Amino acid sequence: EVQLVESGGGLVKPGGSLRLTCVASGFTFSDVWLNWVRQAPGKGLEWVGRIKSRTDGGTTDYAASVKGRFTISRDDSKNTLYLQMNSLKTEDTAVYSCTTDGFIMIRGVSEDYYYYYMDVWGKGTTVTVSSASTKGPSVFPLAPCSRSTSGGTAALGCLVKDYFPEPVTVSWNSGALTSGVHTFPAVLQSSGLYSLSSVVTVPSSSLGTQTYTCNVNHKPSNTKVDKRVELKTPT
Amino acid sequence: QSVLTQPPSVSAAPGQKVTISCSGSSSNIGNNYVLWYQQFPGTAPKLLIYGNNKRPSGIPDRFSGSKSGTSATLGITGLQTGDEADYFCATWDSGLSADWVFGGGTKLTVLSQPKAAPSVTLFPPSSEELQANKATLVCLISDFYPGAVTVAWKADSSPVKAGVETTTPSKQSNNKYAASSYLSLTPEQWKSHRSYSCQVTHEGSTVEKTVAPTEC
């Protein structure tokens, strides 16, 4: 039962501060070095800093990207690790995890070799630095540029723009339409707002036979939008 | 943008072999020892290789590592469907802070179904959005397998990177993958070009869609 659990993540305005906590259990905390690492959406892992064990000095090292703004400290009596973040910037947005430095020991014919590595990993806590706040989405119709031609299929849809926070739900014709429907995962903009699209594929030669209305629901802001999408009928 | 560079994805059938490269510099891979990790969704990274080529107990010899100059490689033979996961390299920097540094990660797909090219649909900005003083071109990409593509936008056949936001690929209900890309422009810019294209590359083949302001 070896584990690390972090908490404290949340939404913070640029220039703000936030303190994260990481509780360890199942092993002798005071004996190991610990790290804070972070990973922004769709990007690679980035080491934030470390704090050595009391026996090795208990000193800290920080990535160039955070030194001077972030402070790492430990409390061996509480098996707790801390990360004090000040002067937060939007680029500090990411999932923050704590890890320990462990090792594989090899008994050589003379000396014992210790190979260190990030051993235990917490599941992370999410930190969002943005000036964004609860906002309903603007819904726009998605219709093909070139007019649809009979035979084959046509795609139509709804663009659900600038909402926050997740999630949003989309149904078509009050749920009566599910066939050929595909709602895509949202994209996150630099502004901190999300946007997603939902599209339905239908027989081209069928356009004009009925109507298509997307029902968008954004519970966080208690906003509901019903928008009919009208495509040009094949000529 | 990762300190260590790895190909985004790799794939092969069961029983086959693959290699995953990790490129760095003298200050990281060049001076120090390479580690490799295997990671499954919602699970902590697992040590596969340490000391460039040593395997922890439990890791079978199908897994091997090697280091040469400023690059390292992870080899996996006798592919098992159970190997489908993400793999990333790691080592430390020789700088003043001795940072642990990592590769961006490589998704290994163990082919369990035939490859499927992506279906691409490109929508122009709607008249309603243009009247709201905004313009978004929407490129929807679906049903591809393996789950990795690269997206490139063009305006008047010229590359465009600014204003582009592309999502990571996500598994669909049917086990194939989807992704989307958005190109944001002002209404004025939108009307200035004659054509715009969303080109999706998957397993060496490119699928393309185009829209023209005059036609919409």
Binding site: R50, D101, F103, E111, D112, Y114, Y116 | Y33, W92, W100
Partner: peptide
């Protein structure tokens, strides 16, 4: 004694 292989090690 013992050789330490890793960041910030002896």
């Amino acid at each position: 004694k013992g050789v330490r292989i890793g960041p910030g090690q002896a």
